[PDB]
Amino acid sequence: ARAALELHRSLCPLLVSPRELEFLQVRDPSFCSVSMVVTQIHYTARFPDGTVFDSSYKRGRPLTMRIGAGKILRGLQQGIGGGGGVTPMLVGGKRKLMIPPILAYGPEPAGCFSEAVFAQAEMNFCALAA
Amino acid sequence: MMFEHVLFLSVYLFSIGIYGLITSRNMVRALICLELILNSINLNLVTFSDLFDSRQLKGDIFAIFVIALAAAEAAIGLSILSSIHRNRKSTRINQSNLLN
Amino acid sequence: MDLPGPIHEILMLFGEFILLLGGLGVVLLTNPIYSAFSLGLVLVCISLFYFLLNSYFVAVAQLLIYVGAINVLIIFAVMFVNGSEWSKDKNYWTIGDGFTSLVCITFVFSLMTTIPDTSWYGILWTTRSNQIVEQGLINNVQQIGIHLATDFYLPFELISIILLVSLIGAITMARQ
Amino acid sequence: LHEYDIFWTFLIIASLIPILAFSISGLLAPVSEGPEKLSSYESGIEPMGGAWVQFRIRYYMFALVFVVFDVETVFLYPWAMSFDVLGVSVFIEALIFVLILVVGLVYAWRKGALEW
Amino acid sequence: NGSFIFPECILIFGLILLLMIDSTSDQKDRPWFYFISSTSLVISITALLFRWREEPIISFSGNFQTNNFNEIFQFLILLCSTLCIPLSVEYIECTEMAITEFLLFVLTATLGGMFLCGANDLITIFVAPECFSLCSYLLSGYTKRDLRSNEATMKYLLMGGASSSILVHGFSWLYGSSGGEIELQEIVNGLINTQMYNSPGISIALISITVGLGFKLSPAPFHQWTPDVYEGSPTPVVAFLSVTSKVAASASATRILDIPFYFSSNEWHLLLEILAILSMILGNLLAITQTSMKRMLAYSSIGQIGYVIIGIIVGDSNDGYASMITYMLFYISMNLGTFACIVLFGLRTGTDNIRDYAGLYMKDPFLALSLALCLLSLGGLPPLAGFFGKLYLFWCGWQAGLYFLVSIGLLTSVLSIYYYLKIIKLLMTGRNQEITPYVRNYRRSNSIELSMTVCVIASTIPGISMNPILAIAQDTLF
Amino acid sequence: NYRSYVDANDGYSYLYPADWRDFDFLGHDSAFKDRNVQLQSVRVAFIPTQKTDIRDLGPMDEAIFNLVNEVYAAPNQIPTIYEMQERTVDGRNYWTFEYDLEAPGYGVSAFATIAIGNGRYYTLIVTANERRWSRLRNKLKVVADSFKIS
Amino acid sequence: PPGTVPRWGTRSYVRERFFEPGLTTEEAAARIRQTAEGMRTLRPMLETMSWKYVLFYVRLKSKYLDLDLTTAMAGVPEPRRPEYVLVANELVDNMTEFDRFVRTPKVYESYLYYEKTLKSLDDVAEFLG
Amino acid sequence: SKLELLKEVYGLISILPILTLLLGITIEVLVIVWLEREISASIQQRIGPEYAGPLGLLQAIADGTKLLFKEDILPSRGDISLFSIGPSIAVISVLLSFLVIPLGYHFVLADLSIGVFLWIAISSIAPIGLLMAGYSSNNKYSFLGGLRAAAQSISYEIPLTFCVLAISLLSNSLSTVDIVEAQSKYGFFGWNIWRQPIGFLVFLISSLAECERLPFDLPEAEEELVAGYQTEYSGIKYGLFYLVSYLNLLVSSLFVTVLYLGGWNFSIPYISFFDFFQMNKAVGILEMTMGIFITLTKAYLFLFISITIRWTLPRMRMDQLLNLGWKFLLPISLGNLLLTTSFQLV
């Protein structure tokens, strides 16, 4: 399959700061860091220009993952737990990311009789911890 | 065709494992087919833990546990077979419907 | 570690064609002892499938605990079922044979058409960090050796009492 | 754990060995022995007939206790390999494990299971 | 190095003691272990009393569970076992069977059920159903010289092997499609970095899991195995199963369906519904035509009553789980009461069929009254407890939109009133020339009396005192 | 410590103390391992990388960290980098350093070294289980304090 | 920056190449160029000894680039294309040896070819376009 | 181009060393049957197979060639469906075990880190073939004649496992080469047979019944019915059974010496055979032949010990054999492991 519908806003950010590996951008840091343990975030992922293909809000409880052991996109694990040259996101923080296609799925898609991600894409995120 | 041809044989065993189960007439044949189904699921499991999940094996351990429980069940069922053949002097399965 | 080369698919097809006939012998032949021996053949030819893929323990153990204990136990068991040589000729039993050979084939068709629509070779690329670790320097009897006791502590502690209870029950039941 | 190609070649060769020997025997053999050939060794003239010779009642218990007590070893092997690699916790864990089945064997010994 | 298994380590200690005493002691055991096992059970209950109002802290390397909601069921299974053992002591006592390993089996099955209540591991939640099922084909057939007790081992072992097979195959499909993952919480991640979630596959690993779940708690389309076994096995193990199997299965189902199946709601909410709408129908019609007591109880108290429990799992926004907990707490008591009464009367007379309960009100009125109370409660009449159970189950479940499940529930409850009132009518009678010479020779008259009388008033009081129970059951987030 | 073997690969020439049953692990051209314990001494592997002296791969403390935490690691570990030192014995600019890889249970240690001379970035390593890493540390450093090329 | 074109993944390698028959000229010119920027991502996975993907990826990308190189090269400029065939030999023998030096896992030769395997593939696709 | 496969047609496998192992094991079978027929029947007797040349050096292969023809009979009840299938499993179960067995310094056929585990797994496949063969016919003297042996064999692998594990936990490995590595330290002090003789006793006593010693207690008393399930098996069938028996004996001897003794180590440690001279020139063929030498003699010692024991004890009946295998060897073969745990705790 391929993209479906959604609706939201974005709370327009400042200019992104690439920091030599990815595209970093901060919106609101609040409370406290997180070690290599289970976290619980809320995402809303875009395509490079406009399209939205999934959003944690399109389901119930925002999904829960592991920040610290490689189980997620390297871009995220660099931009949520804190990468080289980037401060980690607080407990109630909120950040915005543009993921280059080397820290992502790379130059091959994920097919299901129709690739659910454009081959060699580079997507966007609006990640808010919880 | 490693990652693809084996799974194409999981079902082609699992299905058979069920059929021999249903059309079974003697207890030992039903138990054989049960073991066959468990081995089918085992095989469908292991290959998944060889393509991926090589840092920390999560399938091979589960395969080991499945084999252990299969052996335990195959022991207990045959033990019950001993007592039934003691009570009645024939183990024809489909000719005992006095509980209906 | 890895495999020789294009000899792989040869052994793959060979073992598949052997296992199919093995299962058919398990399910068709009326003489139960022939069925059990064909089951043993099925299990050794599936142990070879386990060994082809570079998973060594879950192959040799499966060969020891099944192609050994379980098969000889079943052989001992078939020394308690008397009366063989039932009917024959194209679904010997009632129409239930046809009804099964129908519903099982529907089940097949369903799963056998579900499978060839998932790009397994594409589901392998999306996980390029799982099988990218190897812990740094390990062989594949220590991988299981440690990862069985470092995080799979509770089920390993549990299985023993299951074994003990099964032993006690088997002895109390089989004995008159 | 590098190359089992020798293992595969040895498998195919040693599996061809028995059929090779049988076929070699068959080629240079006699097409003869159309005698009775329906009775086997050390038999009272043509003895024939009989069944229900099982005595499975005794040996079945041995088979069962063996099948149950076998699973110990394939769990001990990953532990027996990972003693020094890990600390001493696995020592206590495997001690609990083995002691459970020691108690089981003690029970099978006291109540008559392993008999004549 | 952890006290979150100590509620089960105590049980393991008691298990080892029970196994040892037969190896060492000679004959002083029969009334000794009868209470020594109860000591282990009550000590485990006291240990679980400590962890009230606790954290969702994760287990050993994150294996089974430790939160509030799971702890509720962990205590509830212990409650069932504590009430059930005194029943399954004297019954097997009056059969000249070995009693030690029977109590060992019951204890180990309770242990498996307790571990199952957690098990967010995808492997522990597979071994534990076996630790609960492998110790079930033994009890359900542990009268070897009988004949029916072998039929209710064949057509229980075959079924419980096939179903666990289907379930573990669904588990394997999930492990495959999920890029490789076991931890129950960490699936909706891993099923996303591997983008194969919305694809076929998952749709198969959902049905191949829900079916294996259903079989373990027997809704209608797979109920086939329950009516037979419940008649073929001894009545105490029938009660033990019909309480703790349902409790453990319903504790595992909600977690295995709510944690890793966020997205598929609209495709399993319907599915479970199709079961419930059948479970509360086919489990009642047949219940009318029954003449045996155990089989009629199998139909009514299980074939149906496993309906309205589910009747909120579909309609749940975490505002309903309290109602499931309350209904389970009501059902355990309102079922163990009638099973205790049935065990007592059957032992005292030697029959099971309905047509022999005539006149029992005149010979011994206390037992007839304490059975009529529990039966009417099962019927769900206002002043009793089953009424308030079904009520708060509907009032939260009509408050969630779905309409064509509450109406069917009320209608099948009205239908279920029939056989309850039938047996009740058969109690009250005085036509001396009708009562068979079974109740006529009944020397009317400890353990079973105590259990029956302390289990029957809990089928009348909580239905009116459900305020603190409700206030307690609202703090469940799992 | 006691034996001194070039291992005839025309390149390195390093030391290894004792019996050392001389396995062949996966880093070809040499290896050595003990008998009683696991996770033991030197292995060395070659690579082609047509650059020049190691000082070109970047600043020491950064090029060392981009591989002590990204290559000699695993997502199920925590690495910890201790002291690090340049050698400059023949202008090759070796980079000897001792780090730890803590795991659920393992906790291995290492004295890695690197070269860039005409053999294009081939590295050494040593290791021992943590329960005993303290008692023989200075026995292994002189091992790493042997790596030169030809 | 909109989405992209999947362009015939979509199968399970028994549907593709066995049951969905179709391969047009200049369409194999996509697979050929894709396995160039494709096979240039294993460098990190050759740095760390992940000897289990450096076989599966090579087998798949080869069995894909062992048919396209026979179809695509029929559709290059046919007046002058012996070199576009005098490259497939290299671009399919370097890989046929790469598959040797991963079976019995080596490091020196494996990596010495993991550069001289991509250095060529940028020239087979070069004669295409 | 490279149409299908350039260098991968058939030129990646050589079958020379496997055939060399085959020739060697056949020659060693001749040697061991010569040992038996010339020592067992010559303690206080006449010489063994004389008149077959100078001595019976050709007698063994002569019996082999005679058995080769012998008109295989294939009795009526039961047929090729299971008859020819029977001894194949028997012969393969012991032939495949030759893989991980070493012979000298760098002469192993496969590293195979699961080596001794593979050997233990392949040792418990023969009973299947024995039951199949003994049931391939219909009459008695083969059904129970094979049932007895298949049953009593099952009652011994547990001590085998709990004695092999009591050495794997000492060498911290599962590949024979590393086992002899952990044993070449002190020449003969470090030999495990002195470190764990309680395990060696169990292994040695179990090895007897594990390779069918004795299958018949007396030169006149049969193999408990009329013969050991090999009555109708006339030609190459009985030849293969004779083989598999001798091969089980050989593998057991080789494994006990490669485990409890120094595999190819001299009485002085194996590495020490090079340092005391300050230089070596042509130690290659010397060490190869000396690895075949110092190893085969140790197993020869056990061959001779078994030959002697053959004429010193009346092999028990299968009313005592099960008792000994279960209530005697199991407790001590567990206790030695319980001891060696704390012994290797350091």
Curated annotation (Swiss-Prot), chain H:
GO MF annotation list: NADH dehydrogenase activity; oxidoreductase activity, acting on NAD(P)H, quinone or similar compound as acceptor; quinone binding
Catalytic activity as recorded in UniProt: a plastoquinone + NADH + (n+1) H(+)(in) = a plastoquinol + NAD(+) + n H(+)(out); a plastoquinone + NADPH + (n+1) H(+)(in) = a plastoquinol + NADP(+) + n H(+)(out)
Cited InterPro entries: NADH_UbQ_OxRdtase_su1/FPO, NADH_UbQ_OxRdtase_su1_CS
Keyword flag Endoplasmic reticulum: no
Compartments in which it is found: Plastid, Chloroplast thylakoid membrane
Mode of membrane association: Multi-pass membrane protein
Chief place of localization: plastid
Enzyme class of the recorded protein, top EC level: translocase
Entry's Gene Ontology cellular component terms: chloroplast thylakoid membrane
Transmembrane region(s): 15-35, 89-109, 114-134, 150-170, 188-208, 233-253, 289-309, 328-346
SUBUNIT field: NDH is composed of at least 16 different subunits, 5 of which are encoded in the nucleus.
Protein name listed in UniProt: NAD(P)H-quinone oxidoreductase subunit 1, chloroplastic
Gene giving rise to this polypeptide: ndhA
